[PDB]
Amino acid sequence: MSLRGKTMFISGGSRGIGLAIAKRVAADGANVALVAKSAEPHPKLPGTIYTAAKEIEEAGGQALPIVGDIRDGDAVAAAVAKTVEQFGGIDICVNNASAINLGSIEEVPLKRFDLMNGIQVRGTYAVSQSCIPHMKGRDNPHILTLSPPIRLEPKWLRPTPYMMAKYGMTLCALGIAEELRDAGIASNTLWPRTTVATAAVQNLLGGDEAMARSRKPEVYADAAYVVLNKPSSYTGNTLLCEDVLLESGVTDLSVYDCVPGSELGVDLWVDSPNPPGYTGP
């Protein structure tokens, strides 16, 4: 199996994890539409949708960068319609747009909350809803949402704003899995076990330094790829990247380590940097 001739709609996509997923899918000769709020370069975060588009093309795919605020429902509709008029249908919807603040309810004002809820909970809903009609006909359609398993033990219910937003994304994805089961559209979530170091991290740290406790964005891209090739019956799952990769046949997870043979750190909502019983390097 292969994503050749298939079309992806991805929120974000302009850097880091989203870019790596876009690139991986593009490498099979896929189409990728990517939507972001602005096309102006940021002084500290690398990339724009346009430079993302070049990288998608250089990888072997066709790119459609679209300017649109995921918090504006009309802009979302317009971006999907534009994807459909250009590529003819949607095989893959990846909800990657994100927003983060790790403060408590006492520290995170309503305006910051709305940006998180807006982009992630509302955004995942609007993007997914708008994609769904254009996915019904297709060979093996997948919605994939970049969010964590719902962990209900007290330690995990923190910090509240961000947990609400991320769990809200996952709940959207799991609900959709049930509501679209008869239509045959897969909806899954996918989350990495460690922190993922992206170029943006280097830029903000201000150095060319090794993130020894972290993994590369490829861990997410390769895991996504495996999931997007499963049958549309593989649905309603809250998946971890490394676990997905071992189940697929990868034996050596060190190829994802920023620095191999280090003690790895853990992502939020994850107990261990590696799957249970992993013995590889």
Q: Name the residues that contact Cl ion, by CB under 5 A.
A: 16, 71, 109-112, 118, 153-155, 198-199, 217, 270-271, 276
Q: Which amino acid is at 76?
A: V
Task: Kindly write out the interface string for residues 125-154 of this chain, putting x where it contacts its own copies by CB under 8 A and - elsewhere.
Answer: xx-xx--x-----------------x-x-x
Q: Which residue has the tokens 């066709």?
A: 62
CA distance 258 to 234: 30
Q: How far is the CB of 133 from its own copies (least distance, A)?
A: 8
219 contacts its own copies (rule: CB under 8 A)? no
102 contacts its own copies (rule: CB under 8 A)? no
Nearer to Cl ion, 13 or 217 (CB): 217
121 contacts its own copies (rule: CB under 8 A)? yes
12 contacts its own copies (rule: CB under 8 A)? no
Q: Active-site residue numbers?
A: 162
| Piece of 20-28, 93-101, 107-115, 220-228 that binds its own copies (CB under 8 A) | 107-115
Nearer to its own copies, 153 or 263 (CB): 153
Q: How far is the CB of 148 from its own copies (least distance, A)?
A: 13
168 contacts its own copies (rule: CB under 8 A)? yes
Burial class of residue 222 (count of CB atoms within 10 Å of its CB; 0-12, 13-18, 19+)? buried
Residues 62-101 that bind its own copies (CB under 8 A): 73
Instruction: Name the site residues for its own copies (rule: CB under 8 A).
Output: 73, 104-106, 110-111, 113-114, 117, 121-122, 125-126, 128-129, 132, 150, 152, 154-155, 157-161, 163-164, 167-168, 171-172, 174-180, 236
